[PDB]
Amino acid sequence: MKKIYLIRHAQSEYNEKGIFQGRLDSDLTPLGFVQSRLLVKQFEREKPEVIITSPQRRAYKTALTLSDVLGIDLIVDERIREMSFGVLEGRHFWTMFEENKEMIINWLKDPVKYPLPTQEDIKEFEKRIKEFLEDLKSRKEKVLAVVGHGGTLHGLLCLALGIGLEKMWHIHMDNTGISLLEYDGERFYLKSLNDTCHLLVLD
Amino acid sequence: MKKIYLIRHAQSEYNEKGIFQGRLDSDLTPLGFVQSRLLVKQFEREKPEVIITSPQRRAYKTALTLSDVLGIDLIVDERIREMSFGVLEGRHFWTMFEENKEMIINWLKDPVKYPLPTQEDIKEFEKRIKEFLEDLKSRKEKVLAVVGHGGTLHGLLCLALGIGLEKMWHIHMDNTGISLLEYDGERFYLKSLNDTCHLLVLD
Protein backbone atom coordinates (compact mmCIF):
# COMPACT_ATOMS: atom_id res chain seq x y z
CA MET A 1 0.00 0.00 0.00
CA LYS A 2 1.04 3.64 0.55
CA LYS A 3 3.14 4.44 3.64
CA ILE A 4 2.78 7.99 5.00
CA TYR A 5 5.27 8.86 7.74
CA LEU A 6 4.03 11.90 9.64
CA ILE A 7 6.93 13.67 11.36
CA ARG A 8 6.58 16.52 13.83
CA HIS A 9 9.34 19.10 13.26
CA ALA A 10 12.37 19.28 15.54
CA GLN A 11 12.60 21.50 18.62
CA SER A 12 12.23 25.24 17.95
CA GLU A 13 13.27 28.14 20.22
CA TYR A 14 9.69 28.82 21.21
CA ASN A 15 9.09 25.10 21.98
CA GLU A 16 12.12 25.09 24.31
CA LYS A 17 10.76 28.18 26.07
CA GLY A 18 7.27 26.73 26.38
CA ILE A 19 5.71 29.57 24.29
CA PHE A 20 2.45 29.07 22.27
CA GLN A 21 3.78 29.62 18.69
CA GLY A 22 1.25 29.02 15.89
CA ARG A 23 2.09 31.37 12.99
CA LEU A 24 5.19 32.67 14.80
CA ASP A 25 8.32 31.34 13.15
CA SER A 26 11.22 30.71 15.52
CA ASP A 27 14.38 28.86 14.47
CA LEU A 28 15.42 25.34 15.42
CA THR A 29 17.52 25.14 18.56
CA PRO A 30 20.93 23.44 18.48
CA LEU A 31 19.09 20.42 19.90
CA GLY A 32 16.55 20.67 17.09
CA PHE A 33 19.34 20.37 14.51
CA VAL A 34 20.71 17.34 16.36
CA GLN A 35 17.26 15.71 16.45
CA SER A 36 16.90 16.30 12.72
CA ARG A 37 20.21 14.63 11.97
CA LEU A 38 19.30 11.59 14.13
CA LEU A 39 15.95 11.35 12.37
CA VAL A 40 17.84 10.38 9.23
CA LYS A 41 18.64 6.96 10.74
CA GLN A 42 14.98 5.91 10.66
CA PHE A 43 14.93 6.23 6.85
CA GLU A 44 18.28 5.16 5.40
CA ARG A 45 17.10 1.65 4.52
CA GLU A 46 13.59 2.47 3.25
CA LYS A 47 13.93 5.95 1.74
CA PRO A 48 10.76 8.05 1.31
CA GLU A 49 10.18 9.01 -2.33
CA VAL A 50 9.06 12.55 -1.40
CA ILE A 51 9.18 14.79 1.68
CA ILE A 52 6.35 17.30 2.05
CA THR A 53 6.84 20.10 4.59
CA SER A 54 5.17 23.06 6.25
CA PRO A 55 6.84 26.27 5.00
CA GLN A 56 7.42 27.39 8.62
CA ARG A 57 11.14 27.36 9.34
CA ARG A 58 11.07 24.87 12.22
CA ALA A 59 9.44 22.35 9.83
CA TYR A 60 11.33 23.26 6.66
CA LYS A 61 14.73 22.95 8.28
CA THR A 62 13.82 19.54 9.75
CA ALA A 63 12.68 18.34 6.29
CA LEU A 64 15.80 19.81 4.68
CA THR A 65 18.14 17.75 6.84
CA LEU A 66 16.40 14.62 5.59
CA SER A 67 16.10 15.83 1.98
CA ASP A 68 19.77 16.73 1.84
CA VAL A 69 21.31 13.79 3.67
CA LEU A 70 19.22 11.18 1.83
CA GLY A 71 18.77 12.89 -1.55
CA ILE A 72 15.00 13.19 -1.57
CA ASP A 73 12.78 15.69 -3.35
CA LEU A 74 11.29 18.29 -0.98
CA ILE A 75 7.90 19.90 -1.54
CA VAL A 76 6.55 22.82 0.51
CA ASP A 77 2.82 22.89 1.23
CA GLU A 78 1.22 25.84 3.00
CA ARG A 79 -1.82 23.74 3.83
CA ILE A 80 0.07 22.05 6.72
CA ARG A 81 1.32 25.26 8.38
CA GLU A 82 0.43 25.36 12.04
CA MET A 83 -2.96 26.50 13.26
CA SER A 84 -3.03 30.20 14.10
CA PHE A 85 -3.72 31.13 17.71
CA GLY A 86 -4.31 34.83 17.12
CA VAL A 87 -3.84 36.97 20.22
CA LEU A 88 -2.45 34.07 22.24
CA GLU A 89 0.63 33.54 20.07
CA GLY A 90 3.87 34.41 21.83
CA ARG A 91 2.55 33.75 25.32
CA HIS A 92 3.98 31.33 27.84
CA PHE A 93 1.62 28.40 27.75
CA TRP A 94 1.60 27.38 31.43
CA THR A 95 1.26 31.02 32.52
CA MET A 96 -1.74 31.20 30.21
CA PHE A 97 -3.18 28.00 31.63
CA GLU A 98 -2.98 29.29 35.21
CA GLU A 99 -4.89 32.42 34.23
CA ASN A 100 -7.45 30.57 32.06
CA LYS A 101 -7.63 27.00 33.40
CA GLU A 102 -11.13 26.28 32.13
CA MET A 103 -10.55 27.80 28.69
CA ILE A 104 -7.48 25.62 28.11
CA ILE A 105 -9.02 22.49 29.61
CA ASN A 106 -12.14 22.87 27.47
CA TRP A 107 -10.04 23.46 24.36
CA LEU A 108 -7.96 20.32 24.92
CA LYS A 109 -11.09 18.23 25.59
CA ASP A 110 -12.84 19.39 22.40
CA PRO A 111 -11.27 22.22 20.32
CA VAL A 112 -14.16 22.15 17.87
CA LYS A 113 -16.82 22.98 20.46
CA TYR A 114 -14.48 25.14 22.58
CA PRO A 115 -12.07 26.97 20.26
CA LEU A 116 -9.69 29.49 21.75
CA PRO A 117 -10.43 33.22 21.40
CA THR A 118 -9.19 34.57 18.05
CA GLN A 119 -7.80 31.22 16.93
CA GLU A 120 -8.03 30.22 13.28
CA ASP A 121 -11.56 29.25 12.30
CA ILE A 122 -11.79 25.53 13.02
CA LYS A 123 -13.87 24.84 9.90
CA GLU A 124 -11.31 26.64 7.75
CA PHE A 125 -8.54 24.68 9.45
CA GLU A 126 -10.39 21.42 8.82
CA LYS A 127 -10.92 22.34 5.17
CA ARG A 128 -7.24 22.94 4.39
CA ILE A 129 -5.94 19.77 6.05
CA LYS A 130 -8.75 17.68 4.50
CA GLU A 131 -7.73 18.88 1.04
CA PHE A 132 -4.10 18.08 1.78
CA LEU A 133 -5.13 14.57 2.87
CA GLU A 134 -7.23 14.05 -0.27
CA ASP A 135 -4.17 15.02 -2.31
CA LEU A 136 -2.02 12.55 -0.38
CA LYS A 137 -4.46 9.76 -1.28
CA SER A 138 -3.91 10.56 -4.96
CA ARG A 139 -0.14 10.85 -4.94
CA LYS A 140 1.82 8.28 -6.87
CA GLU A 141 4.57 7.59 -4.34
CA LYS A 142 4.49 4.37 -2.31
CA VAL A 143 6.45 5.87 0.63
CA LEU A 144 6.14 9.58 1.62
CA ALA A 145 7.21 11.71 4.63
CA VAL A 146 5.17 14.68 5.86
CA VAL A 147 6.99 17.14 8.18
CA GLY A 148 4.44 19.21 10.03
CA HIS A 149 3.20 20.67 13.30
CA GLY A 150 1.31 19.36 16.27
CA GLY A 151 -2.03 20.78 15.21
CA THR A 152 -1.87 19.82 11.56
CA LEU A 153 -0.41 16.33 12.06
CA HIS A 154 -2.83 15.45 14.87
CA GLY A 155 -5.66 16.83 12.72
CA LEU A 156 -4.57 14.77 9.71
CA LEU A 157 -4.60 11.59 11.84
CA CYS A 158 -8.04 12.39 13.23
CA LEU A 159 -9.43 12.86 9.73
CA ALA A 160 -7.69 9.81 8.24
CA LEU A 161 -9.18 7.59 10.96
CA GLY A 162 -12.56 9.34 10.92
CA ILE A 163 -12.59 10.25 14.57
CA GLY A 164 -13.03 14.02 14.14
CA LEU A 165 -10.95 17.01 15.19
CA GLU A 166 -12.71 16.86 18.56
CA LYS A 167 -9.97 14.32 19.36
CA MET A 168 -6.93 16.18 18.05
CA TRP A 169 -5.49 16.89 21.52
CA HIS A 170 -6.17 13.36 22.83
CA ILE A 171 -2.89 12.30 21.13
CA HIS A 172 0.66 13.56 21.38
CA MET A 173 3.73 13.89 19.20
CA ASP A 174 7.16 14.93 20.48
CA ASN A 175 9.72 16.81 18.38
CA THR A 176 10.78 14.59 15.41
CA GLY A 177 8.24 12.02 16.57
CA ILE A 178 7.19 9.71 13.69
CA SER A 179 3.72 8.27 13.15
CA LEU A 180 3.17 5.83 10.30
CA LEU A 181 -0.17 6.01 8.52
CA GLU A 182 -0.92 3.43 5.84
CA TYR A 183 -3.51 3.84 3.09
CA ASP A 184 -4.80 0.94 0.97
CA GLY A 185 -6.77 2.86 -1.67
CA GLU A 186 -9.90 2.99 0.44
CA ARG A 187 -9.11 3.52 4.12
CA PHE A 188 -6.33 4.32 6.55
CA TYR A 189 -4.52 2.31 9.22
CA LEU A 190 -2.45 3.86 12.03
CA LYS A 191 0.60 1.70 12.55
CA SER A 192 2.45 3.83 15.10
CA LEU A 193 2.27 7.15 16.93
CA ASN A 194 5.11 9.29 18.25
CA ASP A 195 8.08 7.02 17.61
CA THR A 196 11.27 8.74 18.90
CA CYS A 197 13.52 5.69 18.83
CA HIS A 198 16.19 7.68 16.98
CA LEU A 199 16.61 10.02 19.97
CA LEU A 200 17.38 7.28 22.55
CA VAL A 201 21.10 8.04 22.25
CA LEU A 202 20.45 11.46 23.82
CA ASP A 203 19.19 9.90 27.10
CA MET B 1 -0.88 11.54 36.46
CA LYS B 2 -1.30 7.77 36.07
CA LYS B 3 0.89 6.15 33.38
CA ILE B 4 -0.66 3.07 31.80
CA TYR B 5 1.69 1.16 29.48
CA LEU B 6 -0.24 -1.16 27.22
CA ILE B 7 1.93 -3.99 25.88
CA ARG B 8 0.90 -6.52 23.27
CA HIS B 9 2.21 -9.98 24.12
CA ALA B 10 5.30 -11.42 22.43
CA GLN B 11 5.17 -13.52 19.28
CA SER B 12 3.29 -16.82 19.60
CA GLU B 13 3.38 -19.77 17.20
CA TYR B 14 0.01 -18.95 15.65
CA ASN B 15 1.11 -15.31 15.11
CA GLU B 16 4.29 -16.44 13.36
CA LYS B 17 2.28 -18.74 11.07
CA GLY B 18 -0.49 -16.27 10.33
CA ILE B 19 -3.25 -18.31 12.07
CA PHE B 20 -6.36 -16.69 13.66
CA GLN B 21 -6.04 -17.50 17.40
CA GLY B 22 -8.47 -15.78 19.78
CA ARG B 23 -9.15 -18.11 22.73
CA LEU B 24 -6.62 -20.65 21.42
CA ASP B 25 -3.37 -20.82 23.33
CA SER B 26 -0.11 -21.30 21.45
CA ASP B 27 3.24 -20.80 23.15
CA LEU B 28 5.82 -18.10 22.45
CA THR B 29 8.32 -18.71 19.66
CA PRO B 30 12.07 -18.32 20.19
CA LEU B 31 11.66 -14.78 18.85
CA GLY B 32 8.82 -14.11 21.31
CA PHE B 33 11.11 -15.06 24.17
CA VAL B 34 13.80 -12.62 23.11
CA GLN B 35 11.21 -9.90 22.52
CA SER B 36 9.97 -10.43 26.10
CA ARG B 37 13.50 -10.07 27.35
CA LEU B 38 14.17 -6.92 25.30
CA LEU B 39 10.99 -5.27 26.65
CA VAL B 40 12.70 -4.59 29.95
CA LYS B 41 14.86 -1.92 28.31
CA GLN B 42 11.80 0.33 28.09
CA PHE B 43 11.36 0.38 31.87
CA GLU B 44 14.86 1.54 32.84
CA ARG B 45 13.87 5.04 34.02
CA GLU B 46 10.11 4.62 34.65
CA LYS B 47 9.54 1.26 36.43
CA PRO B 48 5.94 -0.01 36.60
CA GLU B 49 4.71 -0.69 40.14
CA VAL B 50 2.55 -3.60 38.91
CA ILE B 51 2.07 -5.67 35.75
CA ILE B 52 -1.43 -6.89 34.86
CA THR B 53 -1.74 -9.69 32.30
CA SER B 54 -4.18 -11.70 30.31
CA PRO B 55 -4.18 -15.31 31.57
CA GLN B 56 -3.44 -16.72 28.11
CA ARG B 57 0.03 -18.19 27.87
CA ARG B 58 1.48 -15.88 25.20
CA ALA B 59 0.55 -12.88 27.36
CA TYR B 60 1.40 -14.42 30.75
CA LYS B 61 4.88 -15.52 29.67
CA THR B 62 5.69 -12.12 28.19
CA ALA B 63 4.58 -10.41 31.39
CA LEU B 64 6.38 -12.91 33.63
CA THR B 65 9.71 -12.08 31.97
CA LEU B 66 9.15 -8.40 32.70
CA SER B 67 7.93 -8.96 36.26
CA ASP B 68 10.86 -11.28 37.03
CA VAL B 69 13.56 -8.92 35.77
CA LEU B 70 12.04 -5.79 37.28
CA GLY B 71 11.07 -7.57 40.50
CA ILE B 72 7.44 -6.49 40.66
CA ASP B 73 4.13 -8.24 41.16
CA LEU B 74 2.34 -9.86 38.24
CA ILE B 75 -1.45 -9.90 38.53
CA VAL B 76 -3.70 -11.91 36.23
CA ASP B 77 -7.02 -10.56 34.97
CA GLU B 78 -9.40 -12.67 32.90
CA ARG B 79 -11.12 -9.58 31.54
CA ILE B 80 -8.33 -8.79 29.03
CA ARG B 81 -8.17 -12.27 27.51
CA GLU B 82 -8.53 -12.05 23.77
CA MET B 83 -11.85 -11.70 21.98
CA SER B 84 -13.26 -15.08 20.92
CA PHE B 85 -13.59 -15.52 17.15
CA GLY B 86 -15.60 -18.76 17.47
CA VAL B 87 -15.33 -21.29 14.67
CA LEU B 88 -12.82 -19.10 12.80
CA GLU B 89 -10.19 -19.63 15.50
CA GLY B 90 -7.46 -21.79 14.04
CA ARG B 91 -7.90 -20.73 10.40
CA HIS B 92 -5.03 -19.42 8.30
CA PHE B 93 -5.90 -15.74 8.14
CA TRP B 94 -4.84 -14.96 4.55
CA THR B 95 -6.54 -18.10 3.24
CA MET B 96 -9.72 -16.98 5.02
CA PHE B 97 -9.44 -13.49 3.55
CA GLU B 98 -9.16 -14.70 -0.07
CA GLU B 99 -12.28 -16.85 0.39
CA ASN B 100 -14.24 -14.19 2.30
CA LYS B 101 -12.77 -10.84 1.23
CA GLU B 102 -15.94 -8.88 1.96
CA MET B 103 -16.52 -10.48 5.39
CA ILE B 104 -12.99 -9.57 6.50
CA ILE B 105 -12.89 -6.08 4.97
CA ASN B 106 -16.20 -5.16 6.58
CA TRP B 107 -15.10 -6.57 9.95
CA LEU B 108 -11.89 -4.53 9.86
CA LYS B 109 -13.78 -1.38 8.82
CA ASP B 110 -16.42 -1.71 11.56
CA PRO B 111 -16.39 -4.87 13.74
CA VAL B 112 -19.43 -3.69 15.71
CA LYS B 113 -21.64 -3.40 12.63
CA TYR B 114 -20.05 -6.38 10.85
CA PRO B 115 -19.12 -9.00 13.46
CA LEU B 116 -17.59 -12.23 12.27
CA PRO B 117 -19.67 -15.44 12.42
CA THR B 118 -19.75 -16.92 15.92
CA GLN B 119 -17.47 -14.20 17.33
CA GLU B 120 -17.81 -13.06 20.94
CA ASP B 121 -20.82 -10.82 21.41
CA ILE B 122 -19.47 -7.30 20.99
CA LYS B 123 -21.56 -5.92 23.86
CA GLU B 124 -20.25 -8.54 26.27
CA PHE B 125 -16.71 -7.85 25.00
CA GLU B 126 -17.15 -4.13 25.52
CA LYS B 127 -18.56 -4.72 28.98
CA ARG B 128 -15.59 -6.70 30.31
CA ILE B 129 -13.04 -4.28 28.75
CA LYS B 130 -14.87 -1.23 30.14
CA GLU B 131 -15.05 -2.75 33.62
CA PHE B 132 -11.34 -3.50 33.42
CA LEU B 133 -10.67 0.10 32.38
CA GLU B 134 -12.79 1.48 35.22
CA ASP B 135 -10.80 -0.56 37.73
CA LEU B 136 -7.64 0.84 36.16
CA LYS B 137 -8.74 4.40 36.94
CA SER B 138 -9.27 3.53 40.62
CA ARG B 139 -5.95 1.73 41.14
CA LYS B 140 -3.46 3.33 43.49
CA GLU B 141 -0.33 2.70 41.41
CA LYS B 142 1.07 5.71 39.58
CA VAL B 143 2.78 3.58 36.88
CA LEU B 144 1.59 0.22 35.60
CA ALA B 145 1.83 -2.06 32.59
CA VAL B 146 -0.96 -4.08 30.99
CA VAL B 147 0.08 -7.08 28.86
CA GLY B 148 -2.71 -8.06 26.53
CA HIS B 149 -3.90 -8.92 23.05
CA GLY B 150 -4.64 -6.96 19.91
CA GLY B 151 -8.42 -6.97 20.37
CA THR B 152 -8.44 -6.13 24.05
CA LEU B 153 -5.68 -3.53 23.96
CA HIS B 154 -7.01 -1.79 20.84
CA GLY B 155 -10.43 -1.83 22.50
CA LEU B 156 -9.17 -0.33 25.73
CA LEU B 157 -7.49 2.45 23.71
CA CYS B 158 -10.69 3.15 21.80
CA LEU B 159 -12.76 3.39 24.97
CA ALA B 160 -10.23 5.54 26.83
CA LEU B 161 -10.18 8.03 23.95
CA GLY B 162 -13.95 7.87 23.45
CA ILE B 163 -13.76 6.89 19.78
CA GLY B 164 -15.77 3.66 19.92
CA LEU B 165 -15.00 0.01 19.26
CA GLU B 166 -15.87 0.64 15.58
CA LYS B 167 -12.28 1.90 15.25
CA MET B 168 -10.52 -1.00 16.99
CA TRP B 169 -8.97 -2.30 13.77
CA HIS B 170 -7.92 1.16 12.63
CA ILE B 171 -4.84 1.00 14.89
CA HIS B 172 -2.11 -1.61 15.07
CA MET B 173 0.25 -3.08 17.68
CA ASP B 174 3.13 -5.38 16.94
CA ASN B 175 4.33 -8.11 19.32
CA THR B 176 5.66 -6.43 22.50
CA GLY B 177 4.60 -3.06 21.04
CA ILE B 178 4.04 -0.55 23.85
CA SER B 179 1.44 2.22 23.93
CA LEU B 180 1.53 4.79 26.74
CA LEU B 181 -1.87 6.04 27.93
CA GLU B 182 -1.88 8.74 30.60
CA TYR B 183 -4.83 9.37 32.93
CA ASP B 184 -5.25 12.65 34.82
CA GLY B 185 -8.22 11.71 37.01
CA GLU B 186 -10.68 12.92 34.41
CA ARG B 187 -9.59 11.88 30.92
CA PHE B 188 -6.97 10.05 28.89
CA TYR B 189 -4.14 11.17 26.56
CA LEU B 190 -2.41 8.78 24.13
CA LYS B 191 1.33 9.51 24.23
CA SER B 192 2.54 6.70 21.97
CA LEU B 193 1.26 3.77 19.95
CA ASN B 194 3.14 0.61 19.01
CA ASP B 195 6.59 1.59 20.29
CA THR B 196 9.06 -1.21 19.45
CA CYS B 197 12.27 0.72 20.08
CA HIS B 198 13.48 -2.13 22.34
CA LEU B 199 13.55 -4.42 19.27
CA LEU B 200 15.88 -2.15 17.20
CA VAL B 201 18.85 -4.37 18.08
CA LEU B 202 17.27 -7.25 16.14
CA ASP B 203 17.02 -5.43 12.78
Residue numbers in the entry:
A (entry chain B), B (entry chain A): 1 to 203
Paper's wording?
The second enzyme, a histidine family phosphatase, only dephosphorylates ARAPDP in the one-pot experiment thus facilitating riboflavin formation. HFP is a dimer in solution, as estimated by preparative gel filtration chromatography. Based on published mechanisms for homologous phosphatases, it is logical to propose that residues R8, R58, and H149 form hydrogen bonds and electrostatic interactions with the bound phosphate group of the substrate, while H9 accepts the phosphate from the substrate, assisted by a proton donor, likely E82. There is significant density in the phosphate site that was modeled as sulfate derived from the crystallization conditions. The HFP identified in this study has the appropriate specificity against substrates of riboflavin biosynthesis to be a dedicated phosphatase for this pathway.
The riboflavin biosynthetic pathway is well-studied with dedicated enzymes to perform complex chemical transformations, with the exception of an unknown phosphatase that catalyzes the dephosphorylation of ARAPDP, the product of RibD, to generate 5-amino-6-ribitylamino-pyrimidinedione (ARAPD), the substrate for lumazine synthase. Using an anaerobic activity-based screen, two phosphatases from Aquifex aeolicus were identified that dephosphorylate ARAPDP, but only one reconstitutes riboflavin production in a one-pot experiment with the other four enzymes of riboflavin biosynthesis. The structures of both enzymes were determined by X-ray crystallography to reveal the vastly different folds capable of performing the ARAPDP dephosphorylation chemistry.
